[PDB]
Amino acid sequence: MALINPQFPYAGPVPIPGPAPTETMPLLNYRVEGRIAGIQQARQFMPFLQGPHREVAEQTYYAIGTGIQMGQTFNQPLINTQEG
Amino acid sequence: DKPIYTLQYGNVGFVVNPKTVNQNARLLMGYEYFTSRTELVNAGTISTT
Numbered sequence: 001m002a003l004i005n006p007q008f009p010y011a012g013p014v015p016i017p018g019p020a021p022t023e024t025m026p027l028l029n030y031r032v033e034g035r036i037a038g039i040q041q042a043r044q045f046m047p048f049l050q051g052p053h054r055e056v057a058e059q060t061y062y063a064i065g066t067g068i069q070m071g072q073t074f075n076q077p078l079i080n081t082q083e084g
Numbered sequence: 085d086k087p088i089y090t091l092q093y094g095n096v097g098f099v100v101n102p103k104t105v106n107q108n109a110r111l112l113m114g115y116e117y118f119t120s121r122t123e124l125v126n127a128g129t130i131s132t133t
Contacts, residue, residue, distance in 0.1 A: 055092075056091045056092060057091065057092065057093075059120070059121070060121075061120070061121065061122060061123045062121070062122060062123065063122070063123045063124075063125050064122045064123070064124065064125075065125065065127060065128070066124070066126075066127035067127060068127075068128065068129075068130065069127055069128070069129055069130075
């Protein structure tokens with residue numbers, strides 16, 4: 001967006017020496033076929049386990065029984081003959 | 085009044101910060117606690133024939 005100087009104008013570009021025209025043109029680089037080499041193993045001996053863990057520990061229980069329940073020799077009360 | 089029951093292992097600890105320690109120095113801890121591993125369903129009787 002330059003302003004044209006009317007007192008000192010200039011013309012378009014003139015030819016100048018050039019950079020040997022084939023040396024600015026590249027070759028198209030020619031890929032050969034390739035292979036991810038080797039026979040891959042199916043599994044890996046991992047350093048960490050792959051499953052979930054638990055944040056807190058919960059107390060577990062198992063039921064037990066008591067035993068054969070016996071009789072008893074109670075201390076027996078007195079007879080309510082109007083004193084009680 | 086507030087018993088320690090802490091649901092992970094090292095969550096509550098007891099600290100001693102000593103200032104002079106001899107060779108065969110140790111702490112002899114003694115605890116007192118409640119625990120429960122079993123459940124206690126009701127029992128059986130005889131009923132002699």
